[PDB]
Design an enzyme around this catalytic site. Structure first.
Site, PDB file in Angstrom:
ATOM      1  N   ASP A  75       0.863  -1.179   0.000  1.00 38.98           N
ATOM      2  CA  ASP A  75       0.000   0.000   0.000  1.00 38.98           C
ATOM      3  C   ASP A  75       0.902   1.232   0.000  1.00 38.98           C
ATOM      4  O   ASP A  75       1.473   1.568   1.041  1.00 38.98           O
ATOM      5  CB  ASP A  75      -0.901   0.062   1.234  1.00 38.98           C
TER       6      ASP A  75
ATOM      7  N   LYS B 222      -7.177   3.133  -1.992  1.00 36.25           N
ATOM      8  CA  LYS B 222      -7.372   3.098  -0.551  1.00 36.25           C
ATOM      9  C   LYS B 222      -7.564   4.532  -0.073  1.00 36.25           C
ATOM     10  O   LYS B 222      -6.909   5.449  -0.577  1.00 36.25           O
ATOM     11  CB  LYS B 222      -6.152   2.425   0.115  1.00 36.25           C
TER      12      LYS B 222
ATOM     13  N   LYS C 199     -10.604  -0.018  -0.784  1.00 32.43           N
ATOM     14  CA  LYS C 199     -10.216  -0.252   0.602  1.00 32.43           C
ATOM     15  C   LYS C 199     -10.426   1.001   1.451  1.00 32.43           C
ATOM     16  O   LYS C 199      -9.581   1.917   1.456  1.00 32.43           O
ATOM     17  CB  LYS C 199      -8.767  -0.737   0.672  1.00 32.43           C
TER      18      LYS C 199
END
Length: 248
Positions: free
Chosen positions: A100, A165, A199
């Site tokens: 990430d 995300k 996410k």
């Protein structure tokens, strides 16, 4: 429906510890928490230095299928590609299953649309060559404006993000239902729902929250879309709430 929602969210969780005082023992405890009485979370999220001991812990407890995710260019999202790429390569070498990486959101707010593209693409190239998934954190709570949130999501997708995300958890404002809707609408409008997951991170705290977030995914893409390749909850606090809703 809440109980069924809670188990679904549990099996999509990126169970997270990202604290300045993290230790090997705290990560080993996290790996044990990821193996719950009702099933395993999708992944854990830890700083890159803890990947090797986490891998051994997950293997020795019989859950090698729990994925190891980590963070790079984190939490700042600076615009130095060489640094972001070097961290991403190190995370791959440690053994990460997933990276990430923080999008250079301040540079985008300053008017630099190209660097976010180039940075995500460079990190995606390294990840894809290692069969590592790349999530891009766009820091919705710092972008703030819906147009910038859409722009950052769009650039990330065009540059090869496997997930988008919301947040690092290291700024005050993280996942919100409105930020989640905007980013999922970008997935929808671009037509990329087969290749790009979503996410929400750091803002989902209760079983009720998690049900609301999954309802957005069900409404936009159908109830079959949100599987581990397309949806995760980045959460360091939610697991106990979901287990409570499940009678554990």
């Amino acid at each position: 429906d809440l109980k069924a929602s809670s188990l679904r969210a549990l099996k999509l969780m990126d169970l997270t510890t990202l604290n300045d005082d993290d230790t090997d023992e705290k990560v080993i405890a996290l790996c044990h928490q990821a193996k719950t009485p009702v099933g395993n979370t999708a992944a854990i999220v830890i700083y890159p230095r803890f990947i090797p001991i986490a891998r051994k812990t997950l293997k020795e407890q019989g859950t090698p299928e729990i994925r190891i995710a980590t963070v790079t260019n984190f939490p700042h999202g600076n615009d130095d590609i060489d640094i972001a790429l070097a961290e991403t390569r190190a995370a791959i070498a440690y053994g990460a299953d997933e990276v990430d990486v923080v999008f250079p959101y301040r540079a985008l707010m300053a008017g630099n649309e190209q660097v976010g593209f180039d940075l995500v693409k460079a990190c995606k190239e390294a990840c894809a060559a290692a069969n590592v998934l790349l999530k891009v954190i766009i820091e919705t709570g710092e972008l703030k404006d819906e147009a910038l949130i859409r722009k950052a999501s769009e650039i990330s997708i065009k540059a090869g993000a496997d997930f988008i995300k919301t947040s690092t958890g290291k700024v005050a404002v993280n996942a919100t239902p409105e930020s989640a809707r905007i980013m999922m609408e970008v997935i929808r409008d671009m037509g990329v729902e087969k290749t790009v997951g979503f996410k929400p991170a750091a803002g989902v705290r209760t079983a009720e929250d998690a049900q609301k977030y999954l309802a957005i995914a069900d409404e936009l893409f159908g109830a079959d879309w949100a599987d581990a390749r397309h949806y995760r909850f980045g959460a360091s606090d939610l697991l106990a709430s979901l287990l409570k809703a499940l009678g554990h």
